[PDB]
């Protein structure tokens, strides 16, 4: 059947970047043309693969990580960047083979008065490793004295909210992101393009 990309991209609600949602896609025919021929995507950078010849290849699995960030942070969803997001929220590996897709979601994720559901991680004791995700709400210690309840001398809650208002600057508007990673193990290839040897 047709791979359920509709359910990932046109998804009614999206996840906070700190708790980025992954969907494994398997056992279907992936019509990648439907994506790159929707010319509504503001970012569509692919690394290590052809633009259209993905439509001919087969893969053991396709993983779709998805989340929401602000526009000027999109540049961090790429190999070997630093910044709040790539360091503390969603790190891509250096040898990344796959595609990063982003589009402006101001008319869906901003609301008059402000949307404070979409969060991100502000403080972490160290950097995330590639494809790692952290959703702990452990009280961050920046000061010297231990915290055990809520807050004290430099005892910040680690998560912060984006404030998404429809009248924010373009750079401060919400963008929805989908990262396709391709997996070709020595096992049956279940995700195939229509122009393959298999059909």
């Amino acid at each position, epitope marked *: 059947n047709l791979c359920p990309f509709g359910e990932v991209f046109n998804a009614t609600r999206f996840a906070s970047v700190y708790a980025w949602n992954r969907k494994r896609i398997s056992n279907c025919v992936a019509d990648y043309s439907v994506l790159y021929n929707s010319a509504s995507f503001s970012t569509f950078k692919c690394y290590g693969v052809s633009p259209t010849k993905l439509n001919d290849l087969c893969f053991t699995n396709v993983y779709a990580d998805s989340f929401v960030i602000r526009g000027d942070e999109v540049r961090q969803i790429a190999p070997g960047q630093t910044g709040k997001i790539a360091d503390y929220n969603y790190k891509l*590996p250096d*040898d990344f083979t796959g595609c990063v897709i982003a589009w402006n979601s101001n008319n869906l994720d901003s609301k008059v008065g402000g949307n404070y559901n979409y969060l991100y991680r502000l403080f972490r004791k160290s950097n995330l490793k*590639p494809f790692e995700r952290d959703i702990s709400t452990e009280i961050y210690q920046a000061g010297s004295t231990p915290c055990n309840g809520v807050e004290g001398f430099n005892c910040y809650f680690p998560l912060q909210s984006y404030g998404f208002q429809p009248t924010n600057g373009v750079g401060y508007q919400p963008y929805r992101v989908v990262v396709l990673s391709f997996e070709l193990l020595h096992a049956p290839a279940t995700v195939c393009g229509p122009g393959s040897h298999h059909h």
Partner: antibody
Amino acid sequence: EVQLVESGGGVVQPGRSLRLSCAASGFIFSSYGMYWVRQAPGKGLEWVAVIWYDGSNKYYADSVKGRFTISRDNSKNTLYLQMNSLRAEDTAVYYCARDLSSSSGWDDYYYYYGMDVWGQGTTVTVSS
Amino acid sequence: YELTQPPSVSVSPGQTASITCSGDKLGDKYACWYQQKPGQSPVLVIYQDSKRPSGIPERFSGSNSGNTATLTISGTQAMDEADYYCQAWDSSTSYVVFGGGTKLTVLG
């Protein structure tokens, strides 16, 4: 008490085949990646296979690729290793082990950290 | 991909002992350390480079930087004499890799 118990080892002839079991108890088995790791006599630990909390994804070491099959029955709290075409260099103690990370169930995401629970092992001698 | 350890390391009781583990871009993956006494199963003593599991003595610490992970036992004791293995799970292909092990001997 968290507990892994291996069983089904023994003496077996090369080229034949054998099915090992690992019985889990005292934790929500269905929510953890599981490992098979072996140790030949006087050698080090050799990774054999690994399986996702739900059995969706399976990875094998090259030495056993195509010959072994890892599987799990989540309803019965059990991990299985089907060993086929046994060679002599397969003689070893076989441990099952649990990864310390658990999936909540909601979005096909899993990161493997250390293997914090180990069984006591089951011994497989493959001789003619 | 291979993780390569010192074959043996001896140490007097009370001294600090260090076991190294080298691999290609090992800093970019998490390292685990397991202890195995004779005729016993392995036990996890370090995970996530430096974290120590519940119930593991505090004298066990761990680091990982560059291409080298290091298990450190300060105040080494008789009951620490064992084989120690490092391990890395590649973020890619979900492949597991052990080290050759290290026979830590405490001269008691």
